[PDB]
Amino acid sequence: EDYEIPSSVSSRKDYGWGDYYLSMVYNGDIPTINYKAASSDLKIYISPKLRIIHNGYEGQKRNQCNLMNKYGKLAISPAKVQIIVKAGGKEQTFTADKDVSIQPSPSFDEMNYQFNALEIDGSGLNFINNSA
């Protein structure tokens, strides 16, 4: 079983803005992927990074977040910073207050939460025509 998994993934399938269109998640990444396969098992280690930039929605909302950003300092709760994954049918959640050793300082320009290694169960990964 040759599992061909890229060593890094940087692309997006979907995107959302925050509730008040005040800030948004910035094109984050999956700087590295590692894995181990076995008959009847697969463990994938993903070490992603979550990035926040206080950019509001284009329009007067972008201008309003700029007035915020340039006239004060940031906030964001690391306990609620998280990555949720679904390998096929199996769901796992990882948080920044457990899997990130150093938190970014508060800032309105950018914050970066780098996760150490998220061990994800790929045995629930359902392949159709040998693709999942």
Partner: protein, 48 residues
């Protein structure tokens, strides 16, 4: 020699019944007892 050392320890871990295991030490007491003892055993035998 490498293969035989792996019966005791594998830095890369082990596969059991097809599953990927989360341990390197294949001898139960070496897997356990991860903390150094504090008070030493008072002896003359390094094996004890």
């Amino acid at each position: 020699a490498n293969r035989w050392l792996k019966y005791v320890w594998s830095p890369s871990g082990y596969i059991v019944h097809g599953q990927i295991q989360n341990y390197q030490w294949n001898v139960r007491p070496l897997l356990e007892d991860t903390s150094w003892n504090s008070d030493p055993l008072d002896s003359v035998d390094p094996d004890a």
